Amino acid sequence: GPQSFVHFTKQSLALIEQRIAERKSKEPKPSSDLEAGKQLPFIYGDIPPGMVSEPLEDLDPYYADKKTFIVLNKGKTIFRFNATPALYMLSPFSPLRRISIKILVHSLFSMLIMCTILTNCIFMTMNNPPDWTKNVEYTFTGIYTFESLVKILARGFCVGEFTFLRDPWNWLDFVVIVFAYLTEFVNNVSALRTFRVLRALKTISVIPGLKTIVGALIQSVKKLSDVMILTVFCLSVFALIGLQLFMGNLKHKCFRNSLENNETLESIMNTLESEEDFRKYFYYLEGSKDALLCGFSTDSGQCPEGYTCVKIGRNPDYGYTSFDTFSWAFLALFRLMTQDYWENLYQQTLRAAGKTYMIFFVVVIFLGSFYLINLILAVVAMAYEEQNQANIEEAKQPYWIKFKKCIYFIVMDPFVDLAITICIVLNTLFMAMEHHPMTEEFKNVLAIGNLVFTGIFAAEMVLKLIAMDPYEYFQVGWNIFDSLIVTLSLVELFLLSVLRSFRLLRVFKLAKSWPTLNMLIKIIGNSVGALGNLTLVLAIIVFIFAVVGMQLFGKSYKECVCKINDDCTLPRWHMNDFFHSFLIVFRVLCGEWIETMWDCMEVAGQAMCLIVYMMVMVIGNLVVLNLFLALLLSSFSSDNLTAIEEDPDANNLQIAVTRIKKGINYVKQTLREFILKAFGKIWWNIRKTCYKIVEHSWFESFIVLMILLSSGALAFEDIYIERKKTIKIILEYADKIFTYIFILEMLLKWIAYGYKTYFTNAWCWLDFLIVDVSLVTLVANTLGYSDLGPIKSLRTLRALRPLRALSRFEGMRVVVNALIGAIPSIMNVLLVCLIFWLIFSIMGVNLFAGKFYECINTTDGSRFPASQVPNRSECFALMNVSQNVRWKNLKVNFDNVGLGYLSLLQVATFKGWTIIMYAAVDSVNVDKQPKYEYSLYMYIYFVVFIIFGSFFTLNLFIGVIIDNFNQQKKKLGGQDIFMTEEQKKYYNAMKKLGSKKPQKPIPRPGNKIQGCIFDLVTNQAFDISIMVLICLNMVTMMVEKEGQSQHMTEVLYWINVVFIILFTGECVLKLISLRHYYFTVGWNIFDFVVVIISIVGMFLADLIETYFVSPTLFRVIRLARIGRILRLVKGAKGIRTLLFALMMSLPALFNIGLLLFLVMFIYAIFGMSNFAYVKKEDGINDMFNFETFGNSMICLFQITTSAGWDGLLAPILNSKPPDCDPKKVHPGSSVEGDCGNPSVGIFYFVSYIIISFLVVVNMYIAVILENFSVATE
Amino acid sequence: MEVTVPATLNVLNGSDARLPCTFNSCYTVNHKQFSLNWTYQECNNCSEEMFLQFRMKIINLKLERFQDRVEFSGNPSKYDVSVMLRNVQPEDEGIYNCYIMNPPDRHRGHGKIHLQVLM
Amino acid sequence: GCVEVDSETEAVYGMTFKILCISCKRRSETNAETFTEWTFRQKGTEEFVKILRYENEVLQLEEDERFEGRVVWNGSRGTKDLQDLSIFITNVTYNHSGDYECHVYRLLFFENYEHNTSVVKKIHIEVVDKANRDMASIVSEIMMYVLIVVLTIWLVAEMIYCYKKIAAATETA
Ligand SMILES: *[C@@H]1O[C@H](CO)[C@@H](O[C@@H]2O[C@H](CO)[C@@H](O)[C@H](O)[C@H]2NC(C)=O)[C@H](O)[C@H]1NC(C)=O
Ligand SMILES: *[C@@H]1O[C@H](CO)[C@@H](O)[C@H](O)[C@H]1NC(C)=O
Ligand code: NA
């Protein structure tokens, strides 16, 4: 107890040694509360002053037998040292070791080391340190030497138990301290500095609580082993498929037909170095670094007249994009899985191979980039849930008085507070009215309004500060926040362009009465509160990665600059200084790494950049995901416990609401009082007949069939409809017949159900609206108004007739019902998110309004230097001097708050954001020519917005989606919410498959040789040998590459033939041994099918390659050898369980995919009818457009992931010359103009990406529920 | 571009003197645009004499003071523009330098070797 | 963009007629300089005779009776990059029935490369007194009407059968 406190004297050491000797002559865990580095229990009480920080005897009985001694500090921290003399020199009773102990366990020592570490970390941010910094580095290494010497003198070096070298974290200190001196007395600067970076990792040891965070991070990884194996296996299989399909295709180029001087493609190719002369023989698009890709099929890209597609040269993107070897294809498949710039590769592969190969990208996107990511997230979330549950499981176990009272009475809760809330809302609306092209009258009005609002807020501050006491005034946090905002507003009134925007923070005062805004506030507070150490670890890791990148590749960027820039100057993203290196690290964490990786590999080498980038990806993504999960679960379950009532103290808004309920009702009642003072079976048979007809299955099948036919007839109406005259006439008359049929169906339903039940049904309402629009269009066409503008606009509404299929299919109906039940909470979170994004939009308008204009040379689109033409007036003077000069603005900017909302959407999705950020960091002023990185540190605006308005906003949305969807599942009894009843029965039947007990063993045949074969094929060695053979075959096909010799091809063919023979022999042996009992196993059936597939595919591929000419069929048929590799799943158990989970998820995913397909079909019809004639620029070109149904669905599958939606929206934002031509003539059509409709385009794209986000979130939750149910059962 | 040359070289009279001039430029040396100049000055402020040069190939000006004792002993592709001097004479003592221009690098290289002849 | 729609084959005597000729470039962003020559072979003859040439926004007509004063331009306008090459007959006669050839001479301009190409299209024109309605439209209208009547008859038959069945069921009760 508290009296168990004695000094460690020589008598105690002698007694301990005597006990040890007695134990030896004769020849258990310590208390976790008494373990080293833990707080002393309160049961021991305080420590007398005479023995704090002194050598004391051991308290834990476990070490009471061994030679140990402990020392306690002034904060009750326990340190366990070793009683054996340090290096056999310093005894515990020596004054020198006593002083060393006193130094080691002390707050000031740790504080000094921490300040030294932070100062050093600040110093490693300079890429060109001055000469005087060498003295500072010497001081740093001297401080580290002193600290290490103190530790070694106190604890002893390595011999003992509790010694200096036993701690893993002291190994880092020793390595750093030997490296410093070795580098000093050994004379690559980059390597030495990158090793100096190791001192930044000492923060974990000095800052309390960081070691626990690192340990939890390491623990979360070890549960990912099976998911990593499955990810590697799936990526390898898809990489092999892509290697078989697309080998050498990205080398297709358009080579000119006419060559002078008896030249040849072979002779030309070895005399070409620069791009200038490569442009003289191959076709290049203007301002492109790569030659235009082409194909040999009809659905591939075409070459201009005078060129022929040929396979020659290098691959695009410095040669780093290809399917030529397994390693490059694996890089491409990892890029697809992470979805980094994947639409560029997707478009290149479609151009080089054909549009028919988008099936590959659909399958790969779904299987990898959705399912594997789901698995990673689910496993990490399960790990963190388990650790959190364990943590909470162990945790539980005179005149002044008069008028100040009058002023206090003046501040009335239901009136003054409501007035302040209204004033805050009005001030926000007033600030949201600013725009760039603003008159002086509007500017003056806004200025006086802001002055009035600031005066009102200051007056309220003063009234509260003199009503209540100033000491009482500063006791509530909201009052401190109000005070800070008021004084900052006054400071700005006395005088930047950003200090004006800090009054926007008053919006958060609405969180006292807005529970959902308070939830976001609590999440943000947790990020720096209970989860402050995890955020600190994330920041330290980002800092370390930034400085490592700068030290490794910073000088290479400057030295090799003309390999990645024609102007021989630094690019936008580089590592030459610390800020740009941090920007690259942050962009990688946002999900964009391959484009900067290409530049890194060009300046510094493939291996180093590959290693560094993958380390950054893995570690940073793991830490960010752990922070996301911690925030989510803490602010979801831990914070919300209903400890207090709903606004326990009567909310002033609620009091005002009650007072309104009193007053308005009383006044209305009194006004009413004053007003009163002043003053046939045959029809039933017809109904039942219609009911019988409508309800029948044949009627429903007929109507479904005609819905499908009418929906599919819309796809035929494209820009080529004038070539198909007969189809056009047939479709017109088919539209007439469909209108008639659906009108008849509506009449039948009217008679069968009655007006009441029909018009209280929502599906019937939708069908009624569709048929009304169709009938109005038909009657207008037949009457004669077929050319009126409104009539044509209404005729564009035939794209919504596929909506009649929602009520006819059960799966889409169930998914739609789930979404409709989820809508309400989504609305509240949407309101919170819109207010949060409005704050950032107003700030961006204050920063960047009217500053993105620039003078450009329209021939090459190059911005003029600011030396010449620094103004707008100089730009106009030059436009009179020169013809191809324009003072042009960005389409997506911060000129007003709606355009700012569009900009923030492009930044949040990371699609189109770079153009906005370049314009922002180049900005100078209004009517001033931009200058390169003039406003360099406006990147902080975008980083802060990304963090707060994407990470925290998505945290809030996911946290409410979880609760809402859990309640949705709870209310109906725990049943699946994305499955139909028949699908539920099939789901249970499938569930009984994976939960089978072991079956009856196969009995051995009676024959001797058959029995020997039986005991040979039923052994484990046989199975492991088959598995290693399968791995060898995988390696054999991983060997294949583009341009390999004929000898390579022949030997690979014969090795694969030998593998086929061996596998067929295994099948024959199993058939002979097991007999017809061999077919009672599903895996045996799969192997038998695989063997047949192998033999037949080999023979058929040989037949095609010998007696036929069809490379495409050859590759598709040779895709059949993949089956021999898919048998590796049989040996692996964890990946087998994960694939069973995918099979379990299949039905709900099918329903959600049906709904997604219908939505994308409707949007494709609308896009064909709207954007089929816009200018081909940005993301719209000769292959990716809205000219046909197939092209439109190609474009819409791409932006379901949101990839490249900004480049598709950009050509639609052209609405007037010189951007477009309203009188453009299109041969073969009567349509005129190539302009867009910006409102229609913005609505189209924003609505589609929002709907895609919601549906894909549904798929995420389905897969996660499947994993959580399967893995925890 | 870091040009690595010996500050001072001592070579016995009557023997050969290799003059190591090396540079590191991160771009490949192509012989169409790479420029190499080798001067000889009796002193720091003395006049410089063109004796060896590279424009597309090794160009030997064959100065009368050196007779025919100057040869190229390097490889421009391997960043080796070292020259050599057969049968060094006492008059060969002086200051030798190698200017290097390797496009597309902006900077121009510069080296200096103080060849000294002892008995 | 550009769609190669074929010309109509039948022209009504005394009325106006447009003879389509559209020749799109394989890549639309390329720059070219195009002109045309039209040759005409009348029925009962076997030799194609040049009638007009259009180049540089001026239409040249050869001295032939059958087309003098009756042909105007209907191709692309305001460019040398002609992808529409059609012509217009303002007063159709019986001497305009025959085979028309639309020779398109395109000169693409590339980087250090000029490619001189050529395209030929054939149009057959028949001059008739009265326009003949398309077979596709006739059969489509007829099939729409028969489908209407078939569906109505089927629905009425089912209604009668079920009404009789439920009436018998009600009288049974
Ligand atoms: C906008 O930029 C120009 C850049 O030259 C400013 O400079 C004037 O330019 C004209 C024509 O060269 C000269 O005649 C004037 O003397 C220049 N002004 C000065 C400061 O000497 C011009 O003043 C700028 N205008 C605005 C609106 O700021
Ligand atoms: C072939 O090339 C030679 C030059 O090597 C040239 O003299 C000769 O005219 C060329 N002949 C043809 C047919 O191009
Ligand atoms: Na990227």
Side-chain angles (χ1 to χ4, degrees), chain A residues 273 559-562, chain B residues 26-27 32 104 106:
Chain A
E273 300 111 47
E559 287 173 357
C560 263
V561 73
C562 312
Chain B
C26 101
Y27 319 104
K32 301 176 201 178
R106 293 170 160 267

PDB file of all heavy atoms in Angstrom, chain A residues 273 559-562, chain B residues 26-27 32 104 106:
ATOM      1  N   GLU A 273      15.078  11.428 -83.711  1.00  0.00           N
ATOM      2  CA  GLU A 273      15.360  11.645 -82.296  1.00  0.00           C
ATOM      3  C   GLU A 273      14.338  12.567 -81.645  1.00  0.00           C
ATOM      4  O   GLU A 273      13.696  12.195 -80.658  1.00  0.00           O
ATOM      5  CB  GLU A 273      16.765  12.220 -82.119  1.00  0.00           C
ATOM      6  CG  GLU A 273      17.870  11.327 -82.646  1.00  0.00           C
ATOM      7  CD  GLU A 273      18.540  11.904 -83.874  1.00  0.00           C
ATOM      8  OE1 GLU A 273      18.878  13.107 -83.858  1.00  0.00           O
ATOM      9  OE2 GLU A 273      18.728  11.158 -84.857  1.00  0.00           O
ATOM     10  N   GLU A 559      17.781  19.590 -62.430  1.00  0.00           N
ATOM     11  CA  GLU A 559      18.853  19.207 -63.346  1.00  0.00           C
ATOM     12  C   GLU A 559      18.323  18.542 -64.609  1.00  0.00           C
ATOM     13  O   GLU A 559      18.854  18.771 -65.700  1.00  0.00           O
ATOM     14  CB  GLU A 559      19.841  18.285 -62.636  1.00  0.00           C
ATOM     15  CG  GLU A 559      20.709  18.997 -61.626  1.00  0.00           C
ATOM     16  CD  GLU A 559      21.560  18.043 -60.822  1.00  0.00           C
ATOM     17  OE1 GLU A 559      21.423  16.818 -61.013  1.00  0.00           O
ATOM     18  OE2 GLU A 559      22.360  18.520 -59.990  1.00  0.00           O
ATOM     19  N   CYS A 560      17.286  17.714 -64.485  1.00  0.00           N
ATOM     20  CA  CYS A 560      16.688  17.011 -65.613  1.00  0.00           C
ATOM     21  C   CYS A 560      15.419  17.694 -66.108  1.00  0.00           C
ATOM     22  O   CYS A 560      14.493  17.024 -66.571  1.00  0.00           O
ATOM     23  CB  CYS A 560      16.390  15.562 -65.233  1.00  0.00           C
ATOM     24  SG  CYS A 560      17.624  14.356 -65.728  1.00  0.00           S
ATOM     25  N   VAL A 561      15.360  19.024 -66.019  1.00  0.00           N
ATOM     26  CA  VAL A 561      14.095  19.729 -66.194  1.00  0.00           C
ATOM     27  C   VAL A 561      13.600  19.713 -67.633  1.00  0.00           C
ATOM     28  O   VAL A 561      12.388  19.783 -67.865  1.00  0.00           O
ATOM     29  CB  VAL A 561      14.220  21.174 -65.670  1.00  0.00           C
ATOM     30  CG1 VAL A 561      15.055  22.029 -66.602  1.00  0.00           C
ATOM     31  CG2 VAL A 561      12.853  21.778 -65.467  1.00  0.00           C
ATOM     32  N   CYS A 562      14.494  19.619 -68.606  1.00  0.00           N
ATOM     33  CA  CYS A 562      14.113  19.668 -70.009  1.00  0.00           C
ATOM     34  C   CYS A 562      13.687  18.318 -70.557  1.00  0.00           C
ATOM     35  O   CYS A 562      13.321  18.230 -71.734  1.00  0.00           O
ATOM     36  CB  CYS A 562      15.260  20.240 -70.837  1.00  0.00           C
ATOM     37  SG  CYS A 562      15.921  21.756 -70.118  1.00  0.00           S
TER      38      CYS A 562
ATOM     39  N   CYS B  26      22.679  15.357 -67.045  1.00  0.00           N
ATOM     40  CA  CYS B  26      21.647  14.335 -66.970  1.00  0.00           C
ATOM     41  C   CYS B  26      21.020  14.017 -68.321  1.00  0.00           C
ATOM     42  O   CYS B  26      20.173  13.121 -68.396  1.00  0.00           O
ATOM     43  CB  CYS B  26      20.575  14.760 -65.964  1.00  0.00           C
ATOM     44  SG  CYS B  26      19.067  15.438 -66.654  1.00  0.00           S
ATOM     45  N   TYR B  27      21.421  14.705 -69.386  1.00  0.00           N
ATOM     46  CA  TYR B  27      20.928  14.439 -70.728  1.00  0.00           C
ATOM     47  C   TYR B  27      21.981  13.687 -71.532  1.00  0.00           C
ATOM     48  O   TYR B  27      23.185  13.886 -71.348  1.00  0.00           O
ATOM     49  CB  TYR B  27      20.557  15.738 -71.449  1.00  0.00           C
ATOM     50  CG  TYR B  27      19.850  16.735 -70.566  1.00  0.00           C
ATOM     51  CD1 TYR B  27      20.514  17.848 -70.078  1.00  0.00           C
ATOM     52  CD2 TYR B  27      18.516  16.565 -70.223  1.00  0.00           C
ATOM     53  CE1 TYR B  27      19.874  18.761 -69.273  1.00  0.00           C
ATOM     54  CE2 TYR B  27      17.869  17.473 -69.416  1.00  0.00           C
ATOM     55  CZ  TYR B  27      18.552  18.570 -68.944  1.00  0.00           C
ATOM     56  OH  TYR B  27      17.913  19.481 -68.140  1.00  0.00           O
ATOM     57  N   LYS B  32      25.484  15.469 -82.724  1.00  0.00           N
ATOM     58  CA  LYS B  32      25.107  16.531 -83.651  1.00  0.00           C
ATOM     59  C   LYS B  32      25.178  17.907 -83.001  1.00  0.00           C
ATOM     60  O   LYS B  32      25.560  18.880 -83.661  1.00  0.00           O
ATOM     61  CB  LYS B  32      23.707  16.281 -84.207  1.00  0.00           C
ATOM     62  CG  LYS B  32      23.563  14.965 -84.949  1.00  0.00           C
ATOM     63  CD  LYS B  32      22.129  14.730 -85.387  1.00  0.00           C
ATOM     64  CE  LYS B  32      21.865  13.259 -85.654  1.00  0.00           C
ATOM     65  NZ  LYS B  32      20.447  13.016 -86.026  1.00  0.00           N
ATOM     66  N   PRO B 104      20.325  19.529 -74.199  1.00  0.00           N
ATOM     67  CA  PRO B 104      19.639  20.816 -74.035  1.00  0.00           C
ATOM     68  C   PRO B 104      19.955  21.520 -72.720  1.00  0.00           C
ATOM     69  O   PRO B 104      19.136  22.287 -72.226  1.00  0.00           O
ATOM     70  CB  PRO B 104      18.165  20.414 -74.122  1.00  0.00           C
ATOM     71  CG  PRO B 104      18.128  19.050 -73.494  1.00  0.00           C
ATOM     72  CD  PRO B 104      19.461  18.402 -73.804  1.00  0.00           C
ATOM     73  N   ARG B 106      21.252  24.321 -70.291  1.00  0.00           N
ATOM     74  CA  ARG B 106      21.433  25.759 -70.455  1.00  0.00           C
ATOM     75  C   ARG B 106      22.860  26.186 -70.137  1.00  0.00           C
ATOM     76  O   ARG B 106      23.436  27.018 -70.845  1.00  0.00           O
ATOM     77  CB  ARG B 106      20.449  26.511 -69.558  1.00  0.00           C
ATOM     78  CG  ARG B 106      18.993  26.358 -69.960  1.00  0.00           C
ATOM     79  CD  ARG B 106      18.072  26.925 -68.892  1.00  0.00           C
ATOM     80  NE  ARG B 106      16.740  27.216 -69.408  1.00  0.00           N
ATOM     81  CZ  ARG B 106      16.361  28.393 -69.886  1.00  0.00           C
ATOM     82  NH1 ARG B 106      17.193  29.421 -69.934  1.00  0.00           N
ATOM     83  NH2 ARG B 106      15.116  28.544 -70.326  1.00  0.00           N
TER      84      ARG B 106
END
